[PDB]
Amino acid sequence: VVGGTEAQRNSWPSQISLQYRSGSSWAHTCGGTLIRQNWVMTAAHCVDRELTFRVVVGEHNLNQNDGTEQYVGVQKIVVHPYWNTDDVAAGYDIALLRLAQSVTLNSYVQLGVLPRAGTILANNSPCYITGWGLTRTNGQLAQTLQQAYLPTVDYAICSSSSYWGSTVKNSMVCAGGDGVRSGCQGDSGGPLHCLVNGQYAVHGVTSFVSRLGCNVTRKPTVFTRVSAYISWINNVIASN
Ligand SMILES: *[SH](=O)(O)C(C)(C)C(=O)NCc1cn(Cc2ccc([N+](=O)[O-])cc2)nn1
Ligand code: NA
Predict the structure, then answer these.
(1) Structurally, how many domains does the chain consist of?
(2) What residue stretches are annotated with the Peptidase S1 domain?
């Protein structure tokens, strides 16, 4: 997250860190959202490389033991069957990870609330991106979870020629684009939390930023629109 602030420890308890094995340790690669005690929602592209993954719930400071973390293996990866790693712009950038064990829920570990199927947010709706991704274009990961206010940019604006044009689809949510605040590398897969009827729900899965930079005016961060995939998510959980 570029231009964020440090999140309070208990603010976003559905946020997870998706990590892969690196030597004798682990490296953060993506965010995700805990959606059942044994399922995480992330971006398909986060699992394009075949590596050993783990999920960390209750994480805050990646480098220090907070006393709140639970670490769990990934037992099954279900990518959207229409995902094409060579065509991120086509959409379908979503995957479900079945965890090897069910995590314990507490003030630091909670299920993310998903929107009703079909929900589309009005332009400029209030949302926050969270993650440990880079804090500047070409920078380094955040040690502590970051948040930034990123109001939505509706499909009509986001897919117009001065924004993302045809690259953005109606199956995506755009947010931000103010040139100061944005998602960045390593936020991918994580949530966009939007306030609807007094409750935050996870409307986006961070999917891509501009190759010209993370925080670029009129290149808002682009998310998979969770509400386009409710039936798919439920079908996967029910059949696995
Ligand atoms: S996102 O918008 O944050 C985006 C697309 C810029 C991003 O940074 N995604 C992160 C990501 C994770 N993966 C999978 C992966 C690739 C390579 C390794 N590796 O060890 O070399 C590990 C994981 N791709 N993009
Ligand atoms: Na920690």
Answers:
(1) 2
(2) 1-238
